[PDB]
Amino acid sequence: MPVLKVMFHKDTNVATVLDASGSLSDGSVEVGTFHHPDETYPDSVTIYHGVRDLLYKRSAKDPSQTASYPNNIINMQVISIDMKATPRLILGTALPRVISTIEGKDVTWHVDVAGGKAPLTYKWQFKANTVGAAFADIDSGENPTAKTATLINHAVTAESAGTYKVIVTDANGTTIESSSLLVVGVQEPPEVASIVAYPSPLALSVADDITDGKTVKFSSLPAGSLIGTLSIKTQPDSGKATAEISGNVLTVKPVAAGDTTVVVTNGTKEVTVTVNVTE
Amino acid sequence: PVLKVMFHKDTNVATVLDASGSLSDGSVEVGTFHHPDETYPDSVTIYHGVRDLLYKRSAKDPSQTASYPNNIINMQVISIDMKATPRLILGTALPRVISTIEGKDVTWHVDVAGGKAPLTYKWQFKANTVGAAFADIDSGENPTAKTATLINHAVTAESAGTYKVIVTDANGTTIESSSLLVVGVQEPPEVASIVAYPSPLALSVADDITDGKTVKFSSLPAGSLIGTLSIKTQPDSGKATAEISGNVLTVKPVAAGDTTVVVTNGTKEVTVTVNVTE
Amino acid sequence: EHLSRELMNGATQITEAVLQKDLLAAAGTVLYAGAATSDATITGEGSTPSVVSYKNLMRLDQILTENRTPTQTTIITGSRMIDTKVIGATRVMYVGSELVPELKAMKDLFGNKAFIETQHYADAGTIMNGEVGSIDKFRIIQVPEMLHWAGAGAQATGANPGYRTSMVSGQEHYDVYPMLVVGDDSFTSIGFQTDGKSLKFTVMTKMPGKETADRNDPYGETGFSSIKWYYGILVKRPERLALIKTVAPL
Amino acid sequence: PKHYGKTIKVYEYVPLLDDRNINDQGIDASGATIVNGNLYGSSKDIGNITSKLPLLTENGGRVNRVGFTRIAREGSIHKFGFFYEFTQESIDFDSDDGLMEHLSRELMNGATQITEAVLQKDLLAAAGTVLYAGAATSDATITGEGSTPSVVSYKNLMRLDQILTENRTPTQTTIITGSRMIDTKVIGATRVMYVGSELVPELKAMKDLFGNKAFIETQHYADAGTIMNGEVGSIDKFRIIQVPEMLHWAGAGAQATGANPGYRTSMVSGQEHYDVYPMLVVGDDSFTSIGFQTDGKSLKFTVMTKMPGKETADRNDPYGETGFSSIKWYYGILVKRPERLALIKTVAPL
Amino acid sequence: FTVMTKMPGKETADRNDPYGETGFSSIKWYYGILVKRPERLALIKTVAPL
Amino acid sequence: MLNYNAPTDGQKSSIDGANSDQMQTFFWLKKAIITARKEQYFMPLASVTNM
Amino acid sequence: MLNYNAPTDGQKSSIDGANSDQMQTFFWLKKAIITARKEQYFMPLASVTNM
């Protein structure tokens, strides 16, 4: 509810509605002030109802003085209203009240705001579903979309679940806000049905690969299953190759030409990597 | 709170204990559950929790887990022994809204059962202003803020807000209730008159020459704004002198005989008769 | 419907209160309880508190007899039921609910119970509407909306033995409560266009629609409802309006 | 009705001249916006009323605008029930072949008693007009010793009737104007009050404002007026009904010491405290009972019985030796006019 | 649509215009929609040639 | 278990998700509570002289 | 002026005090929206041999 001043020219019968910091030097007399988005009934009244209320308390022979009925300014058909104040801020596109997603999907919020004094700035916040959690500014440095009208939270995990709020401010400092609840649906990870090795077979050259070796990466099936801790169950033939595992990466180094195998396990599933060593 | 459950194979006795409790009678730990339930606080209870915990343990050996039909499911022979702290229950909740007017005393009272004694009470207040958070009502000026009953004398328009009481037991378990206080406010009536007391003012030259005597002013009706008082007409300077500060007139005798002081607030007047004796 | 009923109820209550205030202010025969001589001296503490007494009622009856205020009720000469009492009350007194316990605790000249309850004489005489009993000369009628002067008495302190007080200018003062006798021919109501009644309400209601569509509101979205009337009284015999000013217990 | 949750809500419309009527519609007689739109509200002060009169001039105008308000009351129902179990041998080998009839009769009697107790407890907790005997201001300050014990007096009954008259609680009885039988008395009672057996002796020893016996026994006016069931007598404005199962707050009062002149006490946490006893008035239209599927009754009992046999032969009892019988119901009340429920709290003699 | 019309004359004579020289005509209505199955509303957004 | 829970206290039923709630959490008793008009004792006492 | 305001958005009507609100802030359309059963294409192709 920014407060708006109202001034009244008695000869032109023109009411100029200005900002509180505003002024007019045309022979207009201040007739009062009123909150435009009314503070109790913001959508039940407009500027007209405010000018009609301020002019009823002023004299129709000298608007600078006050008066009572039937000697007050009360015919509004003869009165014009000249708006020179900042337009009211209006959320044209509000955020959905609830967005429902699944883990790993990108979400996008978007607000459209009309009115106000350009430029309109934007500030996205987030409250956790945790206990006694308070709205906190989303890092506009890390996520550069949190300083704009459209926030984008890529690959939302369960921790993303919670209330998002945008705060739009005008050049005068008037604000307006919108909020959305994010629900991030979660499913138990599938059990591992198999481990996949890539590349398999692994081709090595004694001439080229003796120093650094080559790597095999492991993944679980179905995709998104927890592969667990990998270990070598069966080492390669030490006369053909050596093998070491770190995380989900097997490094294999050649020793001499000929074929060998490495068996990798997570304790429940096994995968054999065939290793072909050339000269 | 989290309740630990112990089961005794030979006696079919399930013992419910605090998270830190323990037994040494051969009972084995079967699991733990939240009481009250976090999602359905008033739809299940300790019996349901114990049944759910027992459903997933072997009947042959409660230490091991098992599936139906080799699990403990016959509750008719299971005796539940309660040794954990009783659930904290709000016996008498506060009235969600209290309506009153300025100058009235307001009392809030809460009754709480269960928990580990002794209980402690802490009241909080949140103003109606934007962004105002709950703040503890200092128990110093208002001792009642430490007890189950809170008394606020002569509430005012600034007392309107939400009042909350937090009750904590010896184990740190908390339960709270809140109430909204609405204070009816009305325009103060216009001053219809000023009253002076004492009037008449009796002075003695012998006794009152140094300090004088005082007259206090009040407005009618009671609660009207008296405004700024001033002396409109001074007493006869040969009989008395008068000075006014706030709502108090000080009058000093000079010589025996009667005089008057007229005091005004700019709209109303009151005459104080002053009788000076030797 | 709720709003209209409430508006009419408020109007009638306001008229009753205004008439009562005028009658209280027009009293010519004013008696002060205790040693009080004015409103500011009405005090509930001290050695002679301003509490109505049996002798105060006797003297009020004496004053009403000296100026020849006509009596309103006839004495009750008794019935044949056991435990019934005869009543010599001939005048009607109006008091608020606050004073009734004080009147019930009153002692007569011999230290006995002066207040007689209606059941002791309901068989022999008609009980008036709102009557709570009688004292020697007055039949007491309790008025639900009896007014009083809040904080119009003396300043109260911690010595207050339990009488009502109001906050005035940040200080506590004793309330003053009326005990009113409305003598015959004492006053009359000035009926202007009231068709023989003391009052007449004029209710104007306009509902939203084409009735309220106007240059100021082409859509006619708003309506209103108003009530107005005229009222006045002429005090003919101010001495026939007798008043006792006293404190009341908590 | 079904499918509306467990709660009933109702509106209460406040009068214009009432302190609860808080609104922003107020415009005073000069046309200025004012903070209150209820005129002078519930004030009885002459000075305040005069300053807020709706005075009107010949010019009319937008002066003396008022507003209105309404309130919402609510009440809800709760679930109750209990049961017992038995075996086949407890029936077949028992000496008394009528044991089950006794057990079922006792179960139903207990259920009815429990419902009565719960209703009484709710009515006592919902009282809007609470009066404390002596100089007490709460339960914890109710004391039987000291210079002013919290014993109900003639003045407390007088004040309770006064309060019930100011708030316009309807009366329940009419006065008795006497008879021609010698030794009878006239009764001015107009309200009904409920007390326990423990308070009656204290009431029968009560003195009026002038030292005379305040309590009047029923035989002194039974000739001229109907005696209510459970009535023991009358004091001033109240006809006293003795309730056999009246409830009390045991040990809820102040700490009791050797100075106790003979009032009842209970041990609380190893310490002796005075008991608090109620005197209850149930005004008309003060409350109603919420009947969920009760066919117009305030309550309905559901009884579920299974006897030993194939009806209870099961994976848990392959032999069908056990049986059970249970009872359950719903109950709740909606307090419409809490001020019409009046209560006096006092100590009682031993 | 609700149409309100008041022609000049006695119908519009008032202390504001004692002569009743003006009239007016207004039209008003209420409107709204409830979206049951939003996914069945499909939209392509594109530029258009001059 | 599908529980009704306590919707009026913010405890949603099992059937209601983040974007749903009970349509009817209470039953409305449509007969309102009203106070009667205050009594008048002095108005009946007034005689009328026509103006 | 007594205004309806926007009760659904937290703006109480002029008639509702701190203790009251609107009993009916919306109308419930009791005919619910449901999704049809998914189609089957391989089950019809299956012949059956008794076990």
Numbering used by the authors:
A (entry chain K): 1 to 279
B (entry chain L): 2 to 279
C (entry chain C): 152 to 401
D (entry chain D): 52 to 401
E (entry chain I): 352 to 401
F (entry chain C), G (entry chain H): 1 to 51
Copy text verbatim from the article accompanying this structure deposition.
Coliphage N4 is a representative species of the Schitoviridae family of bacteriophages. The most commonly isolated and well-studied group of phages is the order Caudoviricetes, or tailed phages. These phages have an icosahedron-based head containing the dsDNA genome, formed from copies of a major capsid protein (MCP) that adopts the HK97-like fold. Structural analysis of the major capsid proteins (MCPs) and decoration proteins (gp56 and gp17) of phage N4 reveals a pattern of interactions across the capsid that are mediated by structurally homologous domains of gp17.
The N4 capsid was solved using cryo-EM to a final resolution of 2.45 Å. The three unique positions of gp17, hereafter referred to as gp17α, gp17β and gp17γ, were identified to bind around quasi-2-fold axes of symmetry. Gp17 forms three beta-strand-rich Ig-like domains, labelled DI-DIII, from the N-terminus to the C-terminus, separated by a flexible linker. A copy of the DI domain sits on each quasi-3-fold axis, with DII lying principally on the P-domain of a particular MCP. The DIII domain differs considerably in orientation between gp17α and the other two chains due to a bend in the DII–DIII linker by about 130°. Chain α binds the pentamers in the region of the highest curvature, while chains β and γ bind about just one of two unique quasi-2-fold axes near the three-fold axis at the sites of lowest curvature. We propose that a consistent binding pattern benefits the capsid stability by ensuring a copy of gp17 DI is present to reinforce every quasi-3-fold axis of the capsid.
